[PDB]
RNA sequence: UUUGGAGAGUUUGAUCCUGGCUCAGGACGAACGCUGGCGGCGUGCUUAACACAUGCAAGUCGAACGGAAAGGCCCUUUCGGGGGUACUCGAGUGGCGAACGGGUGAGUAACACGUGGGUGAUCUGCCCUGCACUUUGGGAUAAGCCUGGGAAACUGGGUCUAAUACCGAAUACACCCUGCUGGUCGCAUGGCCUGGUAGGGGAAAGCUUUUGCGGUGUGGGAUGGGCCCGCGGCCUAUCAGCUUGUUGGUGGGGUGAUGGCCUACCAAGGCGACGACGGGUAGCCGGCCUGAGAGGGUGACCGGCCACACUGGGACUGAGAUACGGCCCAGACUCCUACGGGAGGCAGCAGUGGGGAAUAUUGCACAAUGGGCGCAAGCCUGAUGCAGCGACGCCGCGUGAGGGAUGACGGCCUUCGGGUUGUAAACCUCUUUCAGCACAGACGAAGCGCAAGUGACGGUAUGUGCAGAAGAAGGACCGGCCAACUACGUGCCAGCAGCCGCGGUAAUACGUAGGGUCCGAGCGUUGUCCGGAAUUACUGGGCGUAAAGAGCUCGUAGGUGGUUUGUCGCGUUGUUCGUGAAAACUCA
């Protein structure tokens, strides 16, 4: 499933503001609840859990799936952390977000799931679609004239684009050079504490 | 039984049983006659019964009542008994 | 009786067969003496990969094929290579390789103008 | 030349150590509780190898045969029906199949399994390929007709009919047996040269006019097996002696084959502390779960082997039999009986009862794949392919997305200011996945058929459009391990709790509210296994006082072995070949 609840509060519990645009946390700094500003016992488990949840709720991934991503990263070679980030960034909701068509991973998820996209000709209603090297992500014919993509092409200068990605058309076709490296990821997070968590 | 094919195969198998019974019994009778001729000590009678019994053993093996290897072992035993006599 | 057969593999609505040689008294999904081909009839050209030399061995030593695999051998010409009627037909058609994703990538880059 | 181990709490006034207990993780053929939307792919009697109603689960061949009961065709015709053939076919004879497939794991601690070998100790229907033939003659009988007995099951008789049924004979000189004999291999019996030679022997089935089918013997091959052996994999000595066909041999028998397999005789051996014989438990394996690995545990699906088919025993038939849906006997149970006798076997599929914490529909179709029969069409196939049921599991998707404040109300706290719930909500905008409505609509089928069509799944999946957030979120936890905290109520009560332990009016541990947190159509609990546990320590522990040196010696088996030369190449090591099934696991 997915988390359809409030978005700011997760960022508040986890410190890092994933999206932004609130004043409660931004004036008084605290996690949610009446017991904000409380005393904290500074446990490594909380640190690790907080990075894991940072990833989970920055993307739209739940734990039973994030576990699989971690396991894929741990099996496949290289550093488990950057492999995991490569996986989490190499999914459709994230690539269209990073391309700026949605300006929120929630919105990107709704778009892909509603089928306002496709990949190499075939429709895709899967936000968890793991894109690959040399992937053309087209938008369908109704969607290009719909309002959200009008907004995309209008405000496609706000947030930057990764290097491994590039938009190519005014119709907002998207291209994938390769898969991202830890420099290409550009996410407010480490990746070691998560693998430590799942190694516990 | 409760199936047509088995109900028929009962009759067929009884038929084949009676056939093979008659044949094997004739064979054992021939062999006891031969062994009587031998333990008594007759020689030419024993040779004649040996030819007859070997013929019948080959015949039964061809009919399938016995295996050719079985017929071979039986008649070989007969021949060796006659020789050592 | 030794026989060329199709062992079903694959998931429920994806009958990927594997062309084996096995006794008739075996079961479909059972132990195979040798694997000589595969048969995936969900492709439109309905893939017919085979191993001709071993097919010819088993036919020469008297492996009675099933009807489907007989048709497959007729397609690959091994049936005809075995008997000798039109020599060896070679009726097989394969799925044409779709263009490389790299080629599509470069084509769309060129179109990005 | 690559790889992958986390700890915490608890003994004390406190410390260190030892040491156990507990927990955090993962998994399940699961169950239970709360909750519950969708699909996809799987999976589902782990207990009573308990008993089973009912229906299906193995038939086919008229191109083997006599025939003609039902259709068909033609004569006939009182329209009641009667004749013929030969399309077609009930029943019957005959052939082939029925030994496969499917189920269960009761038994089995064993060559049952796995792995590797041996078979000069062996079989092998069907299939393929060579060689030689398919000669000749006869006697019945089922069925049918006429009867008889029996309640029934069933069965006796007479008469009559045919065959690829049955039976004799000829030929076979490849084959079998015996005698003599040569060469060669040898791993000893012995094997090969289809050795040679002499003698005596061994068979057959015909049918049909059509893409034609067959039959016998023999050689070879292939397949499927059988038998034997090495090694390997449970507990138990609070089970130490066991064995008398038991160990061996000879001659016979028997087998497909070797062999006490069996028998007469002979000899008196054989097995045991390296655990015989007993007792208990258990199907074995690939694999699965865990684990850093070693290892531990397990043997569900799936796949292979074995064993079994109400219990026990037995054979027959056949190429082949544990003969599930076969036979005989005995026994238990159930049923019919005219009491004389008879009939049965779900551990096949579905299903019922029962037991249980607990496990599905008395479904569709042979469309596909596999099998059987048939020249073939085709028939059969509860194998199988699909569907159904059940969150049982795994995976995926959704339940909305963007914007939206001094931040509404309400709720809970408040140090009374306010803080939070909470960008949450209301409201603007957008989106329609999924579900719903209409239309189309498959792949699966170079298939089957030489008939004109053929898809159970399925008017399903999936594509198109239609409307609107429109129909879609719970569960556990919040003292520490273990993030996450307050108020109120109860105060050694009610209760909680996995361990430490919390409750003895100011409870962050109980109950409820808020709020937070962990997951999310799941969440928790219980049970089981591994881990953590270096807590049986090979990797990887120890024994002065923590549990642990026998009271001490002698000495058997065993284990171990100073310096050195040579050799063997057993261990060891290198390389290669074969095998290590597929699936699995892993990499792509």
PDB file of C-alpha atoms (C1' of nucleotides) in Angstrom, chain A residues 1-10 12-14 19-25 27-28 30-35 37-41 43 45-46 48-49 52-53 56-57 62-65 67-69 74-77 91 102-104 106-110 112-116 123 125-128 140 142-143 146-148 196-200, chain D residues 2-7 24-27 37 290-293 393-407 411-413 418-425 429-434 462-466 469-470 472-474 478-487 508 513-523 585-588:
ATOM      1  CA  UNK A   1       0.000   0.000   0.000  1.00  0.00           C
ATOM      2  CA  UNK A   2       1.122   3.573   0.552  1.00  0.00           C
ATOM      3  CA  UNK A   3       1.110   6.276   3.193  1.00  0.00           C
ATOM      4  CA  UNK A   4      -1.673   8.724   2.366  1.00  0.00           C
ATOM      5  CA  UNK A   5      -1.307  10.650   5.609  1.00  0.00           C
ATOM      6  CA  UNK A   6       0.275  13.998   6.416  1.00  0.00           C
ATOM      7  CA  UNK A   7       3.675  14.595   4.873  1.00  0.00           C
ATOM      8  CA  UNK A   8       5.275  17.329   6.948  1.00  0.00           C
ATOM      9  CA  UNK A   9       5.096  15.427  10.221  1.00  0.00           C
ATOM     10  CA  UNK A  10       7.320  12.602   8.989  1.00  0.00           C
ATOM     11  CA  UNK A  12       9.466  16.742  11.363  1.00  0.00           C
ATOM     12  CA  UNK A  13      10.020  13.504  13.243  1.00  0.00           C
ATOM     13  CA  UNK A  14      13.089  12.955  11.065  1.00  0.00           C
ATOM     14  CA  UNK A  19       9.471  19.120   0.799  1.00  0.00           C
ATOM     15  CA  UNK A  20       9.021  22.271   2.899  1.00  0.00           C
ATOM     16  CA  UNK A  21       6.442  24.995   3.454  1.00  0.00           C
ATOM     17  CA  UNK A  22       5.369  24.953   7.107  1.00  0.00           C
ATOM     18  CA  UNK A  23       5.928  27.345  10.017  1.00  0.00           C
ATOM     19  CA  UNK A  24       5.248  25.271  13.171  1.00  0.00           C
ATOM     20  CA  UNK A  25       8.409  23.170  12.879  1.00  0.00           C
ATOM     21  CA  UNK A  27       9.792  28.445  14.030  1.00  0.00           C
ATOM     22  CA  UNK A  28       9.660  26.017  16.955  1.00  0.00           C
ATOM     23  CA  UNK A  30      10.443  19.774  17.173  1.00  0.00           C
ATOM     24  CA  UNK A  31       9.085  16.431  16.024  1.00  0.00           C
ATOM     25  CA  UNK A  32       5.299  16.044  15.961  1.00  0.00           C
ATOM     26  CA  UNK A  33       3.058  15.429  18.938  1.00  0.00           C
ATOM     27  CA  UNK A  34       2.451  17.197  22.211  1.00  0.00           C
ATOM     28  CA  UNK A  35       5.807  15.825  23.349  1.00  0.00           C
ATOM     29  CA  UNK A  37      10.951  19.405  22.325  1.00  0.00           C
ATOM     30  CA  UNK A  38      11.286  16.428  24.700  1.00  0.00           C
ATOM     31  CA  UNK A  39      14.441  14.831  26.070  1.00  0.00           C
ATOM     32  CA  UNK A  40      16.102  12.296  23.783  1.00  0.00           C
ATOM     33  CA  UNK A  41      18.304   9.339  24.718  1.00  0.00           C
ATOM     34  CA  UNK A  43      20.381   5.802  20.411  1.00  0.00           C
ATOM     35  CA  UNK A  45      18.991   2.486  16.605  1.00  0.00           C
ATOM     36  CA  UNK A  46      16.977   5.685  16.419  1.00  0.00           C
ATOM     37  CA  UNK A  48      19.496   4.243  11.812  1.00  0.00           C
ATOM     38  CA  UNK A  49      15.724   3.845  11.910  1.00  0.00           C
ATOM     39  CA  UNK A  52      15.565   4.258   6.900  1.00  0.00           C
ATOM     40  CA  UNK A  53      12.289   6.094   7.429  1.00  0.00           C
ATOM     41  CA  UNK A  56      10.855   5.370   2.976  1.00  0.00           C
ATOM     42  CA  UNK A  57       8.786   8.534   3.251  1.00  0.00           C
ATOM     43  CA  UNK A  62       6.935   0.653   2.390  1.00  0.00           C
ATOM     44  CA  UNK A  63       9.133  -1.506   4.569  1.00  0.00           C
ATOM     45  CA  UNK A  64       8.326  -4.901   3.064  1.00  0.00           C
ATOM     46  CA  UNK A  65       9.581  -3.473  -0.266  1.00  0.00           C
ATOM     47  CA  UNK A  67      13.723  -4.647   2.642  1.00  0.00           C
ATOM     48  CA  UNK A  68      13.777  -6.246  -0.798  1.00  0.00           C
ATOM     49  CA  UNK A  69      15.646  -3.257  -2.181  1.00  0.00           C
ATOM     50  CA  UNK A  74      23.516  -6.365  -0.514  1.00  0.00           C
ATOM     51  CA  UNK A  75      23.600  -9.279  -2.954  1.00  0.00           C
ATOM     52  CA  UNK A  76      24.668  -7.295  -5.986  1.00  0.00           C
ATOM     53  CA  UNK A  77      28.207  -5.957  -5.958  1.00  0.00           C
ATOM     54  CA  UNK A  91      12.064   4.039 -10.234  1.00  0.00           C
ATOM     55  CA  UNK A 102       5.444  16.711 -10.615  1.00  0.00           C
ATOM     56  CA  UNK A 103       7.602  18.533  -7.996  1.00  0.00           C
ATOM     57  CA  UNK A 104       6.512  15.912  -5.410  1.00  0.00           C
ATOM     58  CA  UNK A 106       3.508  11.712  -4.163  1.00  0.00           C
ATOM     59  CA  UNK A 107       2.312  13.503  -7.285  1.00  0.00           C
ATOM     60  CA  UNK A 108       4.668  11.497  -9.463  1.00  0.00           C
ATOM     61  CA  UNK A 109       3.308   8.315  -7.909  1.00  0.00           C
ATOM     62  CA  UNK A 110      -0.259   9.357  -8.635  1.00  0.00           C
ATOM     63  CA  UNK A 112       2.431   6.905 -12.964  1.00  0.00           C
ATOM     64  CA  UNK A 113      -0.227   4.852 -11.198  1.00  0.00           C
ATOM     65  CA  UNK A 114      -2.981   6.648 -13.101  1.00  0.00           C
ATOM     66  CA  UNK A 115      -1.116   5.944 -16.315  1.00  0.00           C
ATOM     67  CA  UNK A 116      -0.071   9.393 -17.489  1.00  0.00           C
ATOM     68  CA  UNK A 123       1.834   1.723 -20.681  1.00  0.00           C
ATOM     69  CA  UNK A 125       0.883   1.821 -14.045  1.00  0.00           C
ATOM     70  CA  UNK A 126       3.699   0.817 -11.688  1.00  0.00           C
ATOM     71  CA  UNK A 127       5.597   3.456  -9.670  1.00  0.00           C
ATOM     72  CA  UNK A 128       7.989   0.717  -8.598  1.00  0.00           C
ATOM     73  CA  UNK A 140       0.633   9.765 -23.537  1.00  0.00           C
ATOM     74  CA  UNK A 142      -4.158  12.984 -23.334  1.00  0.00           C
ATOM     75  CA  UNK A 143      -1.593  13.574 -20.634  1.00  0.00           C
ATOM     76  CA  UNK A 146      -3.682  17.771 -19.463  1.00  0.00           C
ATOM     77  CA  UNK A 147      -3.119  20.432 -16.836  1.00  0.00           C
ATOM     78  CA  UNK A 148      -0.410  18.746 -14.696  1.00  0.00           C
ATOM     79  CA  UNK A 196      23.719  -1.226   9.605  1.00  0.00           C
ATOM     80  CA  UNK A 197      20.040  -1.343  10.573  1.00  0.00           C
ATOM     81  CA  UNK A 198      19.252  -4.254   8.315  1.00  0.00           C
ATOM     82  CA  UNK A 199      22.448  -6.002   9.428  1.00  0.00           C
ATOM     83  CA  UNK A 200      21.227  -5.874  13.022  1.00  0.00           C
TER      84      UNK A 200
ATOM     85  C1'   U D   2      36.244 -13.482  -3.831  1.00  0.00           C
ATOM     86  C1'   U D   3      34.073 -13.278   0.296  1.00  0.00           C
ATOM     87  C1'   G D   4      30.914 -12.184   5.450  1.00  0.00           C
ATOM     88  C1'   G D   5      29.661 -12.665  12.574  1.00  0.00           C
ATOM     89  C1'   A D   6      26.135  -6.116  16.404  1.00  0.00           C
ATOM     90  C1'   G D   7      24.020  -7.222  21.205  1.00  0.00           C
ATOM     91  C1'   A D  24      15.487  -8.392  20.161  1.00  0.00           C
ATOM     92  C1'   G D  25      15.979 -11.398  13.999  1.00  0.00           C
ATOM     93  C1'   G D  26      14.399 -14.829  10.251  1.00  0.00           C
ATOM     94  C1'   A D  27      11.142 -18.716   8.665  1.00  0.00           C
ATOM     95  C1'   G D  37     -10.148  -3.504  -1.136  1.00  0.00           C
ATOM     96  C1'   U D 290      18.366 -20.620   9.760  1.00  0.00           C
ATOM     97  C1'   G D 291      23.287 -19.368  10.148  1.00  0.00           C
ATOM     98  C1'   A D 292      29.182 -15.249   8.634  1.00  0.00           C
ATOM     99  C1'   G D 293      30.450 -20.052   7.767  1.00  0.00           C
ATOM    100  C1'   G D 393       1.936 -17.382   1.753  1.00  0.00           C
ATOM    101  C1'   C D 394       4.955 -14.146  -1.793  1.00  0.00           C
ATOM    102  C1'   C D 395       4.655  -9.873  -4.949  1.00  0.00           C
ATOM    103  C1'   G D 396       2.413  -5.594  -6.823  1.00  0.00           C
ATOM    104  C1'   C D 397      -1.368  -1.578  -6.861  1.00  0.00           C
ATOM    105  C1'   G D 398      -4.924   1.544  -4.553  1.00  0.00           C
ATOM    106  C1'   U D 399      -7.634   3.872  -0.727  1.00  0.00           C
ATOM    107  C1'   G D 400      -6.106  10.130  -3.718  1.00  0.00           C
ATOM    108  C1'   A D 401      -2.321  14.437  -5.710  1.00  0.00           C
ATOM    109  C1'   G D 402      -0.968  19.990  -5.693  1.00  0.00           C
ATOM    110  C1'   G D 403      -2.396  24.341  -3.043  1.00  0.00           C
ATOM    111  C1'   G D 404      -4.402  25.549   1.469  1.00  0.00           C
ATOM    112  C1'   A D 405      -3.361  29.300   8.165  1.00  0.00           C
ATOM    113  C1'   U D 406      -0.897  32.670  12.893  1.00  0.00           C
ATOM    114  C1'   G D 407      -2.926  27.291  12.327  1.00  0.00           C
ATOM    115  C1'   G D 411     -10.620  16.719  21.162  1.00  0.00           C
ATOM    116  C1'   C D 412      -6.087  16.129  24.857  1.00  0.00           C
ATOM    117  C1'   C D 413      -2.659  18.655  27.793  1.00  0.00           C
ATOM    118  C1'   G D 418      -0.724  28.721  24.939  1.00  0.00           C
ATOM    119  C1'   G D 419       0.754  24.197  22.777  1.00  0.00           C
ATOM    120  C1'   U D 420      -0.425  19.983  19.747  1.00  0.00           C
ATOM    121  C1'   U D 421      -3.892  17.082  16.904  1.00  0.00           C
ATOM    122  C1'   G D 422      -2.452  19.831  12.365  1.00  0.00           C
ATOM    123  C1'   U D 423      -1.043  21.062   5.579  1.00  0.00           C
ATOM    124  C1'   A D 424      -3.869  17.786   9.020  1.00  0.00           C
ATOM    125  C1'   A D 425      -9.094  19.406   8.076  1.00  0.00           C
ATOM    126  C1'   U D 429      -7.678  22.985  -8.524  1.00  0.00           C
ATOM    127  C1'   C D 430      -6.191  18.307 -10.758  1.00  0.00           C
ATOM    128  C1'   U D 431      -6.254  13.032 -11.489  1.00  0.00           C
ATOM    129  C1'   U D 432      -8.321   8.868 -12.510  1.00  0.00           C
ATOM    130  C1'   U D 433      -5.139   4.070 -11.397  1.00  0.00           C
ATOM    131  C1'   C D 434      -8.140   0.179  -8.902  1.00  0.00           C
ATOM    132  C1'   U D 462      -6.424  -6.651 -21.929  1.00  0.00           C
ATOM    133  C1'   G D 463      -7.612  -2.267 -24.749  1.00  0.00           C
ATOM    134  C1'   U D 464     -11.008   1.685 -25.813  1.00  0.00           C
ATOM    135  C1'   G D 465     -14.011   5.284 -24.081  1.00  0.00           C
ATOM    136  C1'   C D 466     -18.008   7.430 -19.213  1.00  0.00           C
ATOM    137  C1'   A D 469     -12.319  11.580  -4.967  1.00  0.00           C
ATOM    138  C1'   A D 470     -15.984   9.692  -6.534  1.00  0.00           C
ATOM    139  C1'   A D 472     -11.881   1.314  -0.472  1.00  0.00           C
ATOM    140  C1'   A D 473      -7.449   1.248   6.535  1.00  0.00           C
ATOM    141  C1'   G D 474      -6.920  -1.237  10.068  1.00  0.00           C
ATOM    142  C1'   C D 478       4.890   3.723  23.610  1.00  0.00           C
ATOM    143  C1'   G D 479       9.638   1.772  31.597  1.00  0.00           C
ATOM    144  C1'   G D 480      14.593  -0.916  29.651  1.00  0.00           C
ATOM    145  C1'   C D 481      15.951  -4.590  25.758  1.00  0.00           C
ATOM    146  C1'   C D 482      12.699  -1.626  22.068  1.00  0.00           C
ATOM    147  C1'   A D 483      11.969   4.996  18.984  1.00  0.00           C
ATOM    148  C1'   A D 484       7.605   6.370  20.849  1.00  0.00           C
ATOM    149  C1'   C D 485       4.583  10.241  26.515  1.00  0.00           C
ATOM    150  C1'   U D 486       1.318  12.968  28.895  1.00  0.00           C
ATOM    151  C1'   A D 487      -3.704  13.512  31.330  1.00  0.00           C
ATOM    152  C1'   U D 508       5.035   7.565  31.411  1.00  0.00           C
ATOM    153  C1'   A D 513      -8.393   8.995  26.326  1.00  0.00           C
ATOM    154  C1'   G D 514      -5.521  12.122  23.433  1.00  0.00           C
ATOM    155  C1'   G D 515      -0.870  12.173  21.048  1.00  0.00           C
ATOM    156  C1'   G D 516       3.045   9.474  19.035  1.00  0.00           C
ATOM    157  C1'   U D 517       5.504   5.102  16.951  1.00  0.00           C
ATOM    158  C1'   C D 518       6.126   0.428  14.119  1.00  0.00           C
ATOM    159  C1'   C D 519       3.971  -2.055  10.191  1.00  0.00           C
ATOM    160  C1'   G D 520       0.201  -1.672   6.665  1.00  0.00           C
ATOM    161  C1'   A D 521      -4.549  -5.290   4.016  1.00  0.00           C
ATOM    162  C1'   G D 522      -2.410  -6.538   7.068  1.00  0.00           C
ATOM    163  C1'   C D 523      -1.144  -6.351  12.298  1.00  0.00           C
ATOM    164  C1'   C D 585      20.571 -21.625  -5.049  1.00  0.00           C
ATOM    165  C1'   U D 586      23.798 -18.065  -7.352  1.00  0.00           C
ATOM    166  C1'   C D 587      25.611 -14.747 -11.696  1.00  0.00           C
ATOM    167  C1'   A D 588      24.020 -12.570 -16.293  1.00  0.00           C
TER     168        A D 588
END
